């Protein structure tokens, strides 16, 4: 991994910008790896979250928020467009109302904003993937 993972990079988000995360599952998709990204509200790991991502490689993505500490209603979408064993490229974009997932440039999903994006200054990169790189592009 040229990155540690977990990977807790510190950040300031607003509308246009794009995180960018490169980097390959560390088991092959019969041992059901996962990713996870994690729009922090504080360096703290117990601060509330403005949007959590985690991928079953082969299977789903799980969306939440957790908000004064409770997690809110989970969404969901079979569109995991990974390979299984290859690099990753999965790009968050910040847009007025949302936050759209692209997955190696296809669009995924739109995670609707509860609250302002602005107010993320971390970002968690975790499980089980080896990062090769982590950019925030405006």
């Known amino acids: 991994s040229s990155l540690p993972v977990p990977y807790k990079l510190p950040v300031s988000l607003s509308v246009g910008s794009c995180v960018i995360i490169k ?3 560390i088991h092959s998709f019969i041992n059901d790896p996962q ?3 994690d729009f922090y509200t504080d360096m703290d790991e117990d601060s509330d979250i403005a949007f959590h ?3 079953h490689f082969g299977n789903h993505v799980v969306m939440n928020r957790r908000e004064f ?6 969404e969901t979408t079979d569109y995991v467009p990974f390979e299984d064993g290859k690099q990753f490229e999965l790009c968050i974009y910040v847009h007025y109302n949302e936050y759209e997932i692209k997955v190696n440039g296809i669009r995924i ?4 904003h509860r609250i302002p994006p602005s107010f ?4 968690q990169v975790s499980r089980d993937i080896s990062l090769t ?4 592009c405006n």
């Open 120 to 123: 993320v200054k971390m970002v």
């Open 109 to 112: 999903y739109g995670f609707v």
């Open 23 to 25: 980097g390959t599952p």
């Open 53 to 55: 991502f985690r991928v």
């Open 69 to 74: 500490g409770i997690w809110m209603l989970e």
């Open 35 to 37: 990713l996870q990204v």
């Open 133 to 136: 790189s982590v950019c925030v």
